[PDB]
Amino acid sequence: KVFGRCELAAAMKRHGLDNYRGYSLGNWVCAAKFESNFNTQATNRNTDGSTDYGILQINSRWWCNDGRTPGSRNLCNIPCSALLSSDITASVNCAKKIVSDGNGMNAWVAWRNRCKGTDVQAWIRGCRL
Ligand SMILES: [Cl-]
Ligand SMILES: [Cl-]
Ligand SMILES: [Cl-]
Ligand SMILES: [Cl-]
Ligand SMILES: [Cl-]
Numbered sequence: 001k002v003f004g005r006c007e008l009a010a011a012m013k014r015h016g017l018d019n020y021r022g023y024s025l026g027n028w029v030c031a032a033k034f035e036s037n038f039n040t041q042a043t044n045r046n047t048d049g050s051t052d053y054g055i056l057q058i059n060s061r062w063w064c065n066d067g068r069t070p071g072s073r074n075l076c077n078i079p080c081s082a083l084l085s086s087d088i089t090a091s092v093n094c095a096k097k098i099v100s101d102g103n104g105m106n107a108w109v110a111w112r113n114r115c116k117g118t119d120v121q122a123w124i125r126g127c128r129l
């Protein structure tokens with residue numbers, strides 16, 4: 001499913017991301033826009049053989065099992081295909097573990113390069129929340 005900007009903001013708020021570990025809702029919507037263009041079915045293969053999955057591009061090296069990333073972990077305890085669903089529950093639950101791991105939202109390269117330090121409130125302007 002490809003979300004609209006306010007539709008995804010509302011779904012993230014409902015699942016408890018707004019100010020989760022000090023990151024306001026606009027940070028999460030900005031990261032989803034640049035990682036996947038709001039498409040739950042996005043995949044991308046990395047040079048090391050791992051793959052990134054879903055609206056927040058979560059990586060199979062550490063976080064989920066895809067049966068093809070030898071010697072990797074599965075810290076979220078889920079098959080990576082669960083991250084491609086139109087229901088964002090599995091993606092959101094796994095992102096809360098990643099953001100808690102010590103490096104905050106710097107775990108997402110597009111957030112560090114395109115959202116960090118910008119006016120992120122803009123991503124939720126006009127939405128009914
Ligand atoms: Cl947009
Ligand atoms: Cl915000
Ligand atoms: Cl594997
Ligand atoms: Cl393959
Ligand atoms: Cl594991």
Ligand SMILES: [Cl-]
Nearest residue numbers: 065078079080
């Ligand atoms: Cl599996």
Ligand SMILES: [Cl-]
Nearest residue numbers: 011087088089
């Ligand atoms: Cl949802």
Ligand SMILES: [Cl-]
Nearest residue numbers: 022103104105
């Ligand atoms: Cl932090």
Ligand code: NA
Nearest residue numbers: 060064072073
């Ligand atoms: Na894995």
